[PDB]
């Protein structure tokens, strides 16, 4: 349902409580000029909404996977 | 003849404060930059005092007579000029072009107009203005 954009307010969500699981999707999308890049979506299943955070910069993305609580069942790919 | 004056009481006839009594305090008959039209700096009540009976207790009366004030720039066209008139001295100062912008200044003003108005209503010097006008 909902999309999130504050990379910080996301991070509160990742603890939150009711949030037992989440998921990291990877898309081989391509930019306006058209060069194959790595979009990566962070989906977080809360009790009654699915907040998916979209990160287009591959750099800041592969970092954030190592900022999720270690007690959250991240499904990779 | 030319009424729009220092201490004229009028009824706001539009927007939120619609229906409520006020006193003009600084007329600005010419157009302001922001505010390119005939307007007036006013101060009226927003929450009137409540009614008072013999049967009322000590602090009940003290409570039923608090008065939530308000201050506004308001277009002359959104005003019902009244025949009534109220002295503007104690607040004359607090209400100027200055006090608009910076909330706190609008705030300290209301603090003062409220002390003044609540005062006016005790030992009923100037009444009417303290009643609701019902429609």
């Amino acid at each position: 349902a909902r999309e999130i954009t504050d990379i910080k307010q996301f991070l509160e969500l990742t603890r939150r409580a009711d949030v037992k699981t989440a998921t990291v999707k990877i898309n081989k999308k391509l930019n306006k000029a058209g060069k194959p890049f790595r979009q990566t979506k962070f989906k977080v299943r809360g009790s009654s909404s699915l907040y998916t955070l979209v990160i287009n910069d591959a750099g800041k993305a592969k970092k954030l996977i190592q900022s999720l609580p270690p007690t959250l069942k991240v499904n990779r790919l | 003849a030319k009424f729009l004056k220092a201490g004229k009481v009028a009824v706001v006839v539009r927007g939120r404060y619609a229906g409520k009594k006020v006193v003009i305090v600084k007329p600005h008959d010419e157009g302001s930059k922001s505010h390119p039209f005939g307007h007036a700096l006013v101060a009226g009540i927003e929450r009137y005092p409540l009614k008072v009976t013999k049967k009322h207790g000590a602090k009940k009366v003290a409570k039923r007579t608090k008065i939530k004030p308000f201050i506004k720039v308001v277009n002359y066209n959104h005003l019902l000029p009244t025949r009534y008139t109220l002295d503007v001295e104690a607040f004359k100062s607090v209400v100027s072009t200055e006090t608009f912008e910076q909330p706190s200044q609008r705030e300290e003003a209301k603090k003062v107009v409220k002390k003044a108005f609540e005062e006016r209503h005790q030992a009923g010097k100037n009444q009417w203005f303290f009643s609701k006008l019902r429609f």
């Binding site: - | 009824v11 006839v13 539009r14 927007g15 939120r16 619609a18 229906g19 019902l80 009244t82 025949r83 006008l133 019902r134 429609f135």
Partner: protein, 112 residues
Amino acid sequence: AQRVTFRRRNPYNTRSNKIKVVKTPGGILRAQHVKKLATRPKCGDCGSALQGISTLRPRQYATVSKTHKTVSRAYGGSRCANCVKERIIRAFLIEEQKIVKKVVKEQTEAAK
């Protein structure tokens, strides 16, 4: 050239069995039943569509925030700005003319 069906036993083209057609992610055409449209809450002293007030079917207003079904003036929903502007004036002018209607007949009382 793809054709469709109602998705509920009602086979008659009534008002409550209005239907829309949708291409699904299946790449297939499908009917989808559509609720009947809401109408604009109207102003209760001139009958005009209330500005600022949302337009849901009636029970929906119970699932909506208060800001959606009012405005900030005397008579939020209810009446229509030009009708409260008329309304106040009419009040003030008459209550004034009362005092007069009153004082004027007290003068011609003494005159007698």
